[PDB]
Ligand binder design. Sequence first.
Ligand SMILES: Nc1nc2c(ncn2[C@H]2C[C@H](O)[C@@H](COP(=O)(O)OP(=O)(O)OP(=O)(O)O)O2)c(=O)[nH]1
Ligand SMILES: Nc1nc2c(ncn2[C@H]2C[C@H](O)[C@@H](COP(=O)(O)OP(=O)(O)OP(=O)(O)O)O2)c(=O)[nH]1
Lengths: 197, 198
Amino acid sequence: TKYAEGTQPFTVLIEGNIGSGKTTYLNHFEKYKNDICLLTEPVEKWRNVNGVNLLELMYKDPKKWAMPFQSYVTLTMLQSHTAPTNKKLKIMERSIFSARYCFVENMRRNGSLEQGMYNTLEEWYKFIEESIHVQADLIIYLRTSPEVAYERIRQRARSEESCVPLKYLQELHELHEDWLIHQRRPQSCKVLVLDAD
Amino acid sequence: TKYAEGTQPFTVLIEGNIGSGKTTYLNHFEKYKNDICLLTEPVEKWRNVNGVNLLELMYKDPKKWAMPFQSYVTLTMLQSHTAPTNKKLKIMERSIFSARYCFVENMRRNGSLEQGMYNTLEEWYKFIEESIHVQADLIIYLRTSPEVAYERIRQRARSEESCVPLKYLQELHELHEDWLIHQRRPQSCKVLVLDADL
Ligand SMILES: Nc1nc2c(ncn2[C@H]2C[C@H](O)[C@@H](COP(=O)(O)OP(=O)(O)OP(=O)(O)O)O2)c(=O)[nH]1
Ligand SMILES: Nc1nc2c(ncn2[C@H]2C[C@H](O)[C@@H](COP(=O)(O)OP(=O)(O)OP(=O)(O)O)O2)c(=O)[nH]1
């Protein structure tokens, strides 16, 4: 009997690459703030962890900050997933699943996470499934190509993000495909694919 | 309500410095164990994480491995605290509180954990307090002098601990004192204090 079990409404998770328009898309729902639980834009927490910019330090030196940053991404997703609400509907930007299946996986391959770091995150993931309820009814995948995503990113112009390589966005693209289209990851609930170009 | 809430018996935590004799003390309880749930020797899980010796890496390279090590220390403590049992008593070696109030404190001070990593662990300690039930009814404190603790570390001769200086243990000792004697941390159920210099 997990933390947050039986407390959660029908839940939609908004997924897609960096710069796929996830926040923008959710913003359309803002006038319904009173009817829907909207948990958007988690980057803002990662940019300010009691005054520390974890997003910034992760980009500057990944072999040091990959793991603490991912640890914190996991915490914040867990806090949104299990956040309490009386509303009939919850919609979330991102989920614990993209952190696990896309980012963590990619940083393992790209070597930002050493084997030991990776195993830690993975045992934590096993324990979270066993102990904490993650409500998941529908994923909406804002599908984009890596070039489009790249362009949206540099226009938005986050100082932290100014050195993000297109290659990286292609690595991430693939993983979102493997997970959300080619059904290559263990997890499965309903997926709705939208084109966003 | 929290995970593991309602499912845990009266629970005792065995605390004290590195080398103070926690495992030894616990073995006195070994003939009883069909009636007592004994969760001993968590260092072993830290020495082999599907092959990886995190203890070794944390000692070889703290600025890089302190973070992921503490993160796994936390997990393994959570797995013990919330491990299910039908027995009327649980006795555990260490707890999540010594990692938070002794080791993490020290690693923050000696620079192994930068503010950002420390902030992250602290945020996690709060969410655990809200999500995960941690049963604690009694702590038994095996009080030693940092010098006896050192002798025992040397006699035991774990290869990971080969470079552990007396200063480290002095630092940790005063941290265990601030928590278990001066009560300068949150709760501490009751603390039974034991002289563990033979
Ligand atoms: N969600 C998530 N973001 C991560 C992770 N590791 C690094 N990041 C970074 C990549 C980005 O620089 C930043 C925000 O990425 P997201 O695509 O989650 O949010 P963003 O507002 O950029 O999405 P949007 O452009 O609104 O579709 O977080 C992770 O494990 N999970
Ligand atoms: N419990 C704990 N140990 C840590 C932490 N960070 C590093 N360590 C190291 C200190 C030691 O090298 C090793 C195990 O120390 P303990 O005092 O927990 O076990 P030990 O078997 O040395 O105690 P004992 O001799 O049985 O009283 O783990 C932490 O956050 N918590």
